[PDB]
Amino acid sequence: WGSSTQALTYHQALTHSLQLCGVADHIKTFRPQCLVMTGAPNSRPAILHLVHAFTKNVGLMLCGHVRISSRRPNFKELNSDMLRYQRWLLNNNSKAFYTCVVAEDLRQGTQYMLQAAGLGRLRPNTLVIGFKNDWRIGDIKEVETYINLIHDAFDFQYGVVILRLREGLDISHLNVADQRLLDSQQFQQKQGKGTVDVWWLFDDGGLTLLIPYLIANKKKWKDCKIRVFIGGKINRIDHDRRAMATLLSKFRIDFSDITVLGDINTKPKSEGLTEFAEMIEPYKLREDDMEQEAAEKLKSEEPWRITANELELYKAKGNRQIRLNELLKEHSSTANLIVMSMPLARKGAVSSALYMAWLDTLSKDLPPILLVRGNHQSVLTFYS
Amino acid sequence: WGSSTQALTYHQALTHSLQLCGVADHIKTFRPQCLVMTGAPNSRPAILHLVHAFTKNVGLMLCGHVRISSRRPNFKELNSDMLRYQRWLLNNNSKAFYTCVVAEDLRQGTQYMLQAAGLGRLRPNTLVIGFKNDWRIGDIKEVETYINLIHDAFDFQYGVVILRLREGLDISHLNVADQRLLDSQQFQQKQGKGTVDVWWLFDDGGLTLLIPYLIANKKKWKDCKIRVFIGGKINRIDHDRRAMATLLSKFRIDFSDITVLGDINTKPKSEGLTEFAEMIEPYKLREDDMEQEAAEKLKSEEPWRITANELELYKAKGNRQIRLNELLKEHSSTANLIVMSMPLARKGAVSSALYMAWLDTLSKDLPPILLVRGNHQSVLTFYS
Numbered sequence: 195w196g197s198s199t200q201a202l203t204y205h206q207a208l209t210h211s212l213q214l215c216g217v218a219d220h221i222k223t224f225r226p227q228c229l230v231m232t233g234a235p236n237s238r239p240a241i242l243h244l245v246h247a248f249t250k251n252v253g254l255m256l257c258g259h260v261r262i263s264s265r266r267p268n269f270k271e272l273n274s275d276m277l278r279y280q281r282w283l284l285n286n287n288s289k290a291f292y293t294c295v296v297a298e299d300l301r302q303g304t305q306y307m308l309q310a311a312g313l314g315r316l317r318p319n320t321l322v323i324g325f326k327n328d329w330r331i332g333d334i335k336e337v338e339t340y341i342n343l344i345h346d347a348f349d350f351q352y353g354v355v356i357l358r359l360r361e362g363l364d365i366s367h368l369n370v371a372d373q374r375l376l377d378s379q380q381f382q383q384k385q386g387k388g389t390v391d392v393w394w395l396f397d398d399g400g401l402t403l404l405i406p407y408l409i410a411n412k413k414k415w416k417d418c419k420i421r422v423f424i425g426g427k428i429n430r431i432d433h434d435r436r437a438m439a440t441l442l443s444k445f446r447i448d449f450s451d452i453t454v455l456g457d458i459n460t461k462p463k464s465e466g467l468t469e470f471a472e473m474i475e476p477y478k479l480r481e482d483d484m485e486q487e488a489a490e491k492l493k494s495e496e497p498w499r500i501t502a503n504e505l506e507l508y509k510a511k512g513n514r515q516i517r518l519n520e521l522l523k524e525h526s527s528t529a530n531l532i533v534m535s536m537p538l539a540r541k542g543a544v545s546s547a548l549y550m551a552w553l554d555t556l557s558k559d560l561p562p563i564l565l566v567r568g569n570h571q572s573v574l575t576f577y578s
Numbered sequence: 579w580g581s582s583t584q585a586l587t588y589h590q591a592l593t594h595s596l597q598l599c600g601v602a603d604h605i606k607t608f609r610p611q612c613l614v615m616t617g618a619p620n621s622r623p624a625i626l627h628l629v630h631a632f633t634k635n636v637g638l639m640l641c642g643h644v645r646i647s648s649r650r651p652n653f654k655e656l657n658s659d660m661l662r663y664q665r666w667l668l669n670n671n672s673k674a675f676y677t678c679v680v681a682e683d684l685r686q687g688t689q690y691m692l693q694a695a696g697l698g699r700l701r702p703n704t705l706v707i708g709f710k711n712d713w714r715i716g717d718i719k720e721v722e723t724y725i726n727l728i729h730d731a732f733d734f735q736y737g738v739v740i741l742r743l744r745e746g747l748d749i750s751h752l753n754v755a756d757q758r759l760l761d762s763q764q765f766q767q768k769q770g771k772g773t774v775d776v777w778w779l780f781d782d783g784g785l786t787l788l789i790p791y792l793i794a795n796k797k798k799w800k801d802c803k804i805r806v807f808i809g810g811k812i813n814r815i816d817h818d819r820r821a822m823a824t825l826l827s828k829f830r831i832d833f834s835d836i837t838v839l840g841d842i843n844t845k846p847k848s849e850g851l852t853e854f855a856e857m858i859e860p861y862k863l864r865e866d867d868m869e870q871e872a873a874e875k876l877k878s879e880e881p882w883r884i885t886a887n888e889l890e891l892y893k894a895k896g897n898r899q900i901r902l903n904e905l906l907k908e909h910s911s912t913a914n915l916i917v918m919s920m921p922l923a924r925k926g927a928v929s930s931a932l933y934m935a936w937l938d939t940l941s942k943d944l945p946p947i948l949l950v951r952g953n954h955q956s957v958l959t960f961y962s
Contacts, residue, residue: 225588295694
């Protein structure tokens, strides 16, 4: 490497950061930035390749890696695990940075990269993580770190994206594992003709239409149709489609159709509640919160006499996701992605084992779904 | 502000960060970066103006601000407290970034900005903080956050700089306060003719000679002499001065003299130990560590029967700083700075109230001293 100009690239990268740090207060744009939670980037490579498709030439991608290590943190060899993985990101045709922290669990490890990552205006706007698939198989303790991470991303006014494949995301290893490897390398190459359909179901979503626009204007996805689905009113159908058409003309998405539905939060048809109730069977008044669990004994000895957190106050919130799953299946069977609004419940009043339980009944048997929710701060400022 | 090219400065600042992130694995320079612990930057302005003198055109300066707020963290208005203070850094002729965190104390607040600040190779190399002046007046509890911050900067292989003025650093408000005001605005303007003398007293120091070189090659300091002081051997004096002269020729400092001393860790002259012992008078076996304090009762009821942490194992460590203080006074009375090696004690074996007690006996009545200690990783790679 015959480069004697590296000292000119240091000051070039530093005065342009001071260039970007100083601009007009009212000239602010959106510029979608994101920290991706990949772990070690040679593992989880679908979450690199998908979040390369948006945030390419238009934002920055930060590959976070919290090293869970309760004992013996080895900081001095870790710099050799910084430059190695960054060279792995550079030898592949990637435009990502890489910051690794050390903590004792996943939540407080990524707390550091929420309120301290980046410099200047090069800060992560959103947080994109993978979906915890094995949340019911064991150790329901450490679901409390994952959901209280989601609630903490919504506290810092971040946008949250959750990616879920039907199989797993991680690769750290035969023909049952052949299902893992090709279907993880499914986004960077070889995209045929199909459909990327969205489900606009929240008014203050924002980002959830910008993401399918940016991913369909790419080299691999321009033979793919954006089918906006929407639940709205019941009586007038022509003009609610018109009301969505003007907004979609603002986002210049160039859709195929805006289908209006009228059977949301009506009828779960007595099918999935038999599966949803046995899903939360070992959590019914065993919802994971040690303090609440200990606390009940000052009011009752049989705990299953109150259902206010459980079902008594959230009837149609629970019944909506079970209604939405068959609507996802009978209309988006063979799609490439599903960009779906993400259900957000309020902290404290709702349990973490119920809030997690809604997020997989919504995404039981699907293509690579994307549960997305913006911060409703401002969007469409992007492209003026 | 008629700027329609801001979108060209975003991608210009981002591809040059990818330029700097990809270089040869052997080519890397030193490039002194630092996070300064200023608090709100309109307060503590000497620690902006001094750390502007080095890390100008040659490194980055990051102005950290941990917002101690145990209750009610207000994240949504805090972005208006980000752009306001960054505009305050930009309207002054500064080249600094600014990241603000929220925590419940000072230590875990700046833990976030140690292992998660910056992107790529634009990470803070060192940590520069101010000296806690009012450590004996009240609440010896919260000295444990300051010293366990110092020990944590030395755990991440950071360099540590501690700046101490004879008066305070903070400005948040008459003629007793007129001493604060002008003497805090003493570094940016109006530097006359004088001396910036260093005390090379540690072999694996490193940075402690690079800092007085970079600050004396500036617009305000080039009528100032660098007088290297050094403690070394006793018998040969001409050739230890020669052995320092070759190293100083490598650092191209262009000094005035290399004075060799021979009365370090010999004789504190029975003067300051009367003041040092009454300094640690309410801490003698009351050294602040609640667990150790509770623990003693399994071995004794009168705690003052063991002196191993206190004086019995650290005779000449304590007597060295009291020896060094009169050497600082009889030789560096009227100087502009004192760049002095920083005493580092091992964690756990030494108390935090003793380690703090050495850091102010070394710096009792001085000019703006600078207690500096490198990470001994590599230095002099800078300027090839």
